[PDB]
Every structure is written in C-alpha cells, then in structure tokens.
C-alpha cells in the first residue's frame, strides 16, 4: 500500500536505580548496524545474591534480570528479549 | 500477559501486580504495566520493611498511535528494591 511518510524532528543519565537496588546491575551496550535501533543497553545483574542490611552479598536470595519482549527492525520485524533491570527473589513466598 | 511467561512478580522482595492499559487508538491496544504492591520491601521475616522502597523499573518504548505517528512512551516492566545506604 502507498505509504506517504513524513519526517518529524544511556539509562545511567535517566535513572540510578541500577546502583541503589539490593539487586544492582551494570548496563552493557549491544551494537548491531543491521538492526534499528543500532545500540541497545542491556542490564546484567552484578551479583548472584542480593545486598543485605549489613552491605554484604546474601545468598539466601538471588538477583534476577527482568526481561521484556520488544519488537525490533532488521526489512523484517523481529521479536527480541532485553534485560531492563534486576529484582531480588527469595525461595520463601509470603 | 506476563503472568504466564514469568512469576518474578510474586517471588520478588519488591513484588508487583500487572495492570491492563487499554487504548484502541494505539498499537498495541493492550499494554500490561507493573505496579509495585507495597511502598516498602519484604524482609527476611516476611514483613513489609520501610527501611527500603519498592520502585518500578521503567523502559522507554516506541508505540504507534489513515494517519499514524511513532511515539515514545514509558512503561513499568517490574519492581526492584532500593535502600538509602549504598555499599
């Protein structure tokens, strides 16, 4: 069909939860020139455990990435999974 | 629906509920958004602890709204637990 398109005019700088979380994370740049957007920032949990009240890595809990299914352009529309940040999970549910 | 793909929403120390955001003039029509269940986080004894806060992790995502426009929208994907003491 006739598309008559018109042209119109880093997470570290937007949010610091990555550093303040009990399940902190680092942000890694995933580069791909054949994909739009070219750069995708992905969260990687710093520790296996979570940071407890005393400031130590506690292995009674785990840091886990929160992933979101997002559509990307490569043209072909593809579904990709990206880590947005980390949360802390425990084996006891209250 | 994220409940069928992942259950971290129920197992997290900063658990969350998923709310349906409906818009017929937007594609996708339905967007599931995370809402933190508590202000505090669940501690070692199973109680809501107010020495820490549950906070949403938001992601900037592009959405579609004869004429269409690509718009940037912010959505909560899940919650994390933050404390006022950084180690």
């Amino acid at each position: 069909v006739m598309v008559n398109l018109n042209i119109h005019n880093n997470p570290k700088r937007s949010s610091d939860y990555y550093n303040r979380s009990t399940s902190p994370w680092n942000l890694h740049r995933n580069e791909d020139p054949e994909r739009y957007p070219s750069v995708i920032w992905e969260a990687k949990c710093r520790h296996l455990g979570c940071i407890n009240a005393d400031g130590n890595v506690d292995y009674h809990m785990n840091s886990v990435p929160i992933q979101q299914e997002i559509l990307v352009l490569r043209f072909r529309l593809e579904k990709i999974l990206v880590s947005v940040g980390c949360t802390c999970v425990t084996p006891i549910v209250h | 629906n994220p409940k069928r793909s992942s259950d971290y929403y129920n197992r997290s120390t900063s658990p969350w509920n998923l709310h349906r955001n409906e818009d017929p003039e937007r594609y996708p029509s339905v967007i599931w958004e995370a809402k933190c269940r508590h202000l505090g986080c669940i501690n070692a004894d199973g109680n809501v602890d107010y020495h820490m806060n549950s906070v949403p992790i938001q992601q900037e995502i592009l959405v579609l709204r004869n004429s269409f426009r690509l718009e940037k929208i912010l959505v909560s994907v899940g919650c994390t637990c933050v404390t006022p003491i950084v180690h």
């Epitope: 949010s15 610091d16 | 809402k35 809501v48 602890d49 107010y50 020495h51 806060n53 906070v55 006022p84």
Partner: antibody, heavy 118, light 111 residues
Framework: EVQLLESGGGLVQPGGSLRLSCAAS????????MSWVRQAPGKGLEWVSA????????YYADSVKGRFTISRDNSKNTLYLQMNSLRAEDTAVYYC???????????WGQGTLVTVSS | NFMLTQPHSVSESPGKTVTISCTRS????????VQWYQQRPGSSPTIVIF?????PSGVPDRFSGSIDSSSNSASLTISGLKTEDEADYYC?????????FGGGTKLTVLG
C-alpha cells in the same frame, strides 16, 4: 552536585492560589522521591507533601489535604506544588527536598517565601 | 499520625559531649529511619545524620546518631562541643504515609 532551585513564591490574598516550582539538576531526578517542607518565620519545620519518583504515589499533611496538589514533570526535572484555597496560616518559606526513600531527606533547596495575607 | 518530642533547648559547655533526644509517641521507632538536621540563622537546614547513623561527607566525626528501641527514641550526640555547633537541631522520621519533624532543639554553647 545536587541543586534544587525553588521559584513561584509571593504575596497572595486568602482563598487565592499559587504554584511553586523546584528545578532539579546534578542527579537522575526521575529515580528520587521528592517532598515539600515549610517553615513559618521563627517556627519549626513542617512537612507538607511528598511524591514518588514516578509520580504514581502522593502523600499530604492533614493541614493541606484537598487544597494542595504535588506533581512532577520528569522530562523537565521539575517538582511542583499547586496551592489553592490558601489561608494566612500557610505563610512560610517552602523548601523543595530530595528523598533517598520515602521519608529520608538528603538535600534541601534554598526555599521560596509564600505570604498569605489580606 | 504520630509526634516527635525533642527538648526545646539544651545548654552545654565547650569540649563536652551533648545529647539531643527525640521520642516517638506512637509506632515503633526502629521500623523507620531517623534523620537529623542542623539549621543556622537565616539558612536552609543541612543534614547532619540520615538513616539513623549515616554521616555525610563534610559533617565532622564529632556528630553521631543512635536509636534506643526500649525508650522509642533517637539521639544526636555531639562530642568535643564547639561554639560553631550553636544552631537549631531537628529530628525527623516517618510512617507509610506521613513524614514528621520534631519541634526542634535550640543548642546554646556556654562560656
């Protein structure tokens, strides 16, 4: 360096309205809960209102419920306090404050003076 | 709701250790972090202590915070008291909805 710059203070008659602003810089604004605290001349500090980082949760002192509205614009790094139905007892210096978590304030602005008088 | 009670004024002599207490009327004090602010005349308050006992950079080692769950109170301790420590001191804490400041303590350095 954390900077919090309040504006909007002035003289208003009872029943009047005023909007205060607080422009923040030197930190990732959207990831911090914010609050307003006031101080009448020669008196103590009085908490007014608080708002979560996302703006999804708001909290108010009983003295200001139904009259004041706290809001924020995360794209502009600005905190607001819309003050309606003002009365003489609202006269004070209003301070913007950055909170590490709800109730833990780490930084204060310079304040803006609000005078409510006939 | 709850209240925080502080002494209206404290006078102490230089070089001594001064304690300013802050008693919570209702709710367990140990369930919520306590902050302490210093306010000099015509100035914005500055933080002295946050999260019960955290001292920010720039705050002298002479200032320390503590909590006593049995008495439901928090304390600000100033060791080696100096005349420059004269100011108003406020304690502050919260509950899941509200934030509350104590009435403030005027600290006078004698001699």
């Amino acid at each position: 360096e954390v900077q919090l710059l309040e504006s909007g203070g002035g003289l208003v008659q009872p029943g009047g309205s005023l909007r205060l602003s607080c422009a923040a810089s030197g930190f990732t604004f959207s990831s911090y809960a914010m609050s307003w605290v006031r101080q009448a001349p020669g008196k103590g500090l009085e908490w007014v209102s608080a708002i979560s980082g996302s703006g999804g949760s708001t909290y108010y002192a009983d003295s200001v419920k139904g009259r004041f509205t706290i809001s924020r614009d995360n794209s502009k790094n600005t905190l607001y306090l819309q003050m309606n139905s003002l009365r003489a007892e609202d006269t004070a210096v209003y301070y913007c404050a950055r909170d590490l978590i709800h109730g833990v304030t780490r930084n204060w602005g310079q304040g803006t003076l609000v005078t409510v008088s006939s | 709701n709850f209240m925080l009670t502080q002494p209206h004024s404290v006078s102490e002599s230089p070089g001594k250790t001064v304690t300013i207490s802050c008693t919570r009327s209702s709710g367990s004090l140990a369930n919520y972090y306590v902050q302490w602010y210093q306010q000099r005349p015509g100035s914005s308050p500055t933080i002295v202590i946050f999260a019960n006992n955290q001292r920010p950079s720039g705050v002298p080692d002479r200032f320390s915070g503590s909590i006593d769950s049995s008495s439901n109170s928090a304390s600000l301790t100033i060791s080696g008291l100096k005349t420059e420590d004269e100011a108003d001191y406020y304690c502050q804490t919260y509950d899941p909805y509200s934030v509350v400041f104590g009435g403030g303590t005027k600290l006078t350095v004698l001699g």
